[PDB]
Amino acid sequence: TMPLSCTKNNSHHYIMVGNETGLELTLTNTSIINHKFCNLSDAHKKNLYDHALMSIISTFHLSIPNFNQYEAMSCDFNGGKISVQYNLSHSYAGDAANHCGTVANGVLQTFMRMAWGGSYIALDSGRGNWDCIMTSYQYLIIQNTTWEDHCQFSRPS
Ligand SMILES: *[C@@H]1O[C@H](CO)[C@@H](O[C@@H]2O[C@H](CO)[C@@H](O)[C@H](O)[C@H]2NC(C)=O)[C@H](O)[C@H]1NC(C)=O
Ligand SMILES: *[C@@H]1O[C@H](CO)[C@@H](O[C@@H]2O[C@H](CO)[C@@H](O)[C@H](O)[C@H]2NC(C)=O)[C@H](O)[C@H]1NC(C)=O
Ligand SMILES: *[C@@H]1O[C@H](CO)[C@@H](O)[C@H](O)[C@H]1NC(C)=O
Ligand SMILES: *[C@@H]1O[C@H](CO)[C@@H](O)[C@H](O)[C@H]1NC(C)=O
């Protein structure tokens, strides 16, 4: 049985994309995906993935800089419902600076500025309003889920 998303040790927020679907964003020290893969092996999975990230980018109004940087990322599918896990490299100042131009960083920024949970540190990046965010959280988890089920992690596969 899956762990809870809504816990005192987690920071969480739900994005309501559709009329009945959405994304549960969870900052946690709990790993949900146990492999190193993100198999977007078909055009359908490939669009669900882009739809998930665009929804985040639109909603949080993320103007993400081009720094040629990446977060370690796994993803999985459970009957059309995607799970994305970021293995965050934001634990120390250099890491935040080197993983600044990522979607995961934008989420951290949003959590920080919106005060959605957890304490963070913003390092001035090179570009405008964009800050490189430090956090002690090990994982950022994004799951296609409903509001009724958003407080418990869904099963990835
Ligand atoms: C999540 O894990 C980290 C360790 O990876 C916990 O500990 C923090 O780690 C950072 C970086 O090593 C330190 O700067 C902090 O001082 C540590 N804090 C504590 C209390 O140990 C972190 O606390 C964990 N968070 C949760 C909510 O479990
Ligand atoms: C993110 O971290 C988790 C946990 O540290 C990784 O999960 C491990 O993945 C390896 C595959 O190389 C397995 O052999 C281990 O059993 C997994 N451990 C656990 C606790 O699940 C995960 O692969 C990492 N993802 C990325 C993209 O780096
Ligand atoms: C992803 O694909 C690789 C190679 O095709 C395979 O070894 C791996 O098991 C796949 N992962 C998942 C979660 O299906
Ligand atoms: C969640 O999955 C369903 C079915 O795959 C899809 O219709 C819906 O758009 C997805 N939600 C998001 C936010 O991508």
Side-chain angles (χ1 to χ4, degrees):
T1 69
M2 301 293 307
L4 299 179
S5 168
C6 307
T7 318
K8 296 185 180 73
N9 288 342
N10 288 0
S11 303
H12 55 80
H13 194 255
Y14 177 80
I15 305 174
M16 188 170 48
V17 177
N19 200 29
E20 287 184 357
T21 65
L23 302 178
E24 170 74 354
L25 279 63
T26 312
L27 286 167
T28 175
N29 278 1
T30 297
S31 181
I32 269 320
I33 301 182
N34 58 337
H35 57 78
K36 295 288 189 294
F37 295 96
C38 186
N39 292 350
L40 308 180
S41 47
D42 57 58
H44 184 59
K45 290 175 181 182
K46 186 171 308 179
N47 286 331
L48 290 169
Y49 176 85
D50 176 80
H51 186 244
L53 295 193
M54 278 305 181
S55 291
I56 291 174
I57 293 175
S58 296
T59 302
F60 295 166
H61 299 312
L62 298 186
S63 59
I64 311 174
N66 309 107
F67 289 165
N68 197 29
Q69 304 173 338
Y70 303 100
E71 294 284 352
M73 181 274 307
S74 285
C75 76
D76 220 331
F77 289 87
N78 189 339
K81 299 182 182 304
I82 192 181
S83 293
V84 181
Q85 180 177 306
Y86 289 111
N87 289 15
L88 301 171
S89 298
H90 290 252
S91 204
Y92 88 92
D95 273 343
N98 290 345
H99 302 83
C100 184
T102 68
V103 168
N105 184 83
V107 170
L108 295 171
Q109 198 177 230
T110 308
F111 268 77
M112 181 198 288
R113 296 183 183 178
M114 299 279 91
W116 282 346
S119 45
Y120 319 86
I121 304 181
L123 300 174
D124 194 354
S125 77
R127 182 54 186 166
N129 209 338
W130 194 263
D131 291 324
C132 302
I133 305 314
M134 274 186 286
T135 184
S136 61
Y137 281 130
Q138 306 176 28
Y139 307 110
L140 165 61
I141 300 177
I142 303 156
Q143 284 188 310
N144 185 340
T145 187
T146 65
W147 167 257
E148 291 79 353
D149 289 318
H150 80 278
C151 265
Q152 183 172 24
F153 282 117
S154 300
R155 189 163 285 111
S157 306

